[PDB]
């Protein structure tokens, strides 16, 4: 729908069949079928129609970008990921919208792989993680179930990067917010599970973390820049 059907399935065939060995091939196949102006729409296709639903092949979709060696395209991909995530964070949420939450989790995972794993930050002008967590806390359990498994999937990538690997101060700061969350009595059980699993995934002891007192500030929580609806 975002491209002519003849222009749609063409870039579809590139990503339909992909593997380790055929990597270089499909890269060149992209480079000489797809005009260098359809790259915003191939970016939209990859993010929306491919990455958002298929976490398994995320690895492959990274190697491609590593094989393609095209920076402007990687930037378009980053911006498209940011935009789709913004859409999901301000959407009308519900206890039935499992599709939207799953899309958000996979988009998070992807963002963690294209930024943190590549030794690149998640800019404060692009997205504020800590503030997103605190806002989700003040806005209820629903926003928490939207946000927490998403931040988990972004931070899982911190381990493969020598930079954001523990004990990176920004990584550990988000981890301290999550640990301050894990101690509430009325936090939903699966989210405590999600947090503990993240701690294990980053080779950290959930008890040796240093929780803050950000959730009792009350005044500060009333003055957060709203990233949610």
């Amino acid at each position: 729908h975002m491209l002519e059907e003849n222009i749609q399935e063409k870039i579809a065939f590139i990503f339909n069949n992909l593997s380790q060995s055929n990597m270089t091939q499909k890269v060149e196949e992209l480079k000489e079928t797809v005009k260098e102006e359809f790259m915003p729409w191939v970016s939209q296709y990859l993010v929306m129609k491919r990455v958002s639903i298929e976490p398994n092949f995320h690895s492959l979709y990274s190697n491609f970008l590593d094989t393609l060696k095209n920076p402007e395209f990687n930037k378009m991909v980053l911006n498209e990921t940011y935009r789709n995530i913004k859409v999901l964070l301000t959407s009308d949420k519900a206890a039935a919208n499992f599709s939207d939450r799953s899309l958000l989790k996979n988009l998070g995972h992807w963002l963690g792989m294209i930024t943190l794993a590549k030794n690149k930050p998640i800019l404060h002008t692009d997205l504020d993680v800590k503030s997103l967590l605190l806002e989700a806390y003040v806005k209820g359990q629903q926003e928490l179930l939207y946000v927490v498994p998403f931040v988990a999937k972004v931070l899982e990538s911190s381990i493969r990067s020598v930079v954001f690997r523990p004990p990176n101060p920004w990584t550990m700061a988000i981890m301290n917010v999550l640990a301050e969350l894990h101690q509430e009595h009325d936090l939903k059980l699966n989210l405590k599970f999600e947090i503990e699993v993240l701690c294990k995934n980053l080779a950290l002891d959930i008890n040796e973390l240093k929780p803050g007192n950000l959730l009792k500030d009350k005044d500060r929580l009333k003055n957060l820049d709203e990233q949610l609806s």
Partner: protein, 264 residues
């Protein structure tokens, strides 16, 4: 208004501005103030090739940073409107932290209010949490300028990693290029400029620059460093610098092969 002093109070306020000047002004000049050096390393001798590095590591893991000065400019050597420099001032307690006598007496003579630092200073690790996701570090396109700055970047890495510096000189440069892909040490570029030598102030007097702000403080040293860079580039290097020949060679350190410490 040229230099904005930053404390634990107005840190976030000015960070808001800096995340917008880095979009239009990508060249960053820097110098640091710190309690000098207190220890010689160990069982290494002055003959090892990488001794300067271990001498750096010994005193950087041991001590804390005092001041950070950052000046923002662009490709042609222009400053953003208003504040072009930020002088970040960190939390340092004399009763509890180490230092060399002479360095503290000098910094006091320059104009460091160590009591105001003690009560209202910025904590380093939160400044790291902020500078991380700011675009000033880790992001391609930014070009860092410095002067005789093995220890300056040593402290920057100490703060950004929240860990002691790696044990060998090789890994340090590795993680360093990651945080700072492009570095021009003026003190190393001077190794190709006939009739330039001396400390920062001597070179500043040779280049007919005018020092704006208090001497021997990080913000003014960084602004003067930027003036020196853009005055020297148009003069010796014909307004361009070969990346392969000068990018990332910290003076006194094994990269680009003679002491690494910014001696007075």
């Amino acid at each position: 208004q040229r230099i904005c002093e930053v404390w634990a109070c107005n840190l976030d306020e000015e960070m808001k501005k800096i995340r917008q000047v880095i979009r239009k002004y990508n060249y960053v000049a820097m110098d640091t103030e710190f309690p000098g050096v207190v220890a010689r390393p160990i069982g290494e001798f002055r003959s090892n090739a990488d001794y300067q590095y271990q001498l750096l590591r010994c005193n950087v893991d041991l001590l804390k940073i005092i001041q950070l000065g950052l000046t923002f400019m662009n490709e042609q050597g222009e400053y953003p409107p208003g504040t072009s420099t930020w002088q970040f001032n960190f939390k340092f307690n004399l009763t509890e932290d180490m230092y060399a006598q002479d360095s503290i007496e000098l910094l006091t003579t320059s104009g460091i209010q160590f009591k105001k630092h003690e009560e209202e200073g910025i904590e380093t690790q939160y400044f790291a949490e902020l500078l991380m996701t700011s675009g000033v570090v880790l992001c391609e396109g930014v070009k860092w300028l410095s002067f005789h700055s093995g220890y300056d970047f040593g402290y920057l890495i100490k703060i950004l990693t929240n860990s002691n510096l790696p044990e060998e000189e090789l890994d340090f440069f590795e993680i360093l290029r990651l945080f700072f892909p492009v570095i021009y040490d003026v003190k190393y570029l001077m190794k190709s400029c006939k009739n330039l030598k001396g400390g920062l102030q001597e070179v500043a007097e040779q280049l007919e620059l005018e020092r704006i702000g208090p001497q021997h403080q990080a913000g003014s040293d960084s602004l003067l460093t930027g003036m020196a860079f853009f005055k020297m580039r148009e003069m010796f290097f014909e307004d361009h610098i070969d990346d392969a020949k000068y990018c990332g060679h910290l003076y006194g350190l094994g990269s680009g092969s003679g002491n690494a410490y910014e001696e007075e």
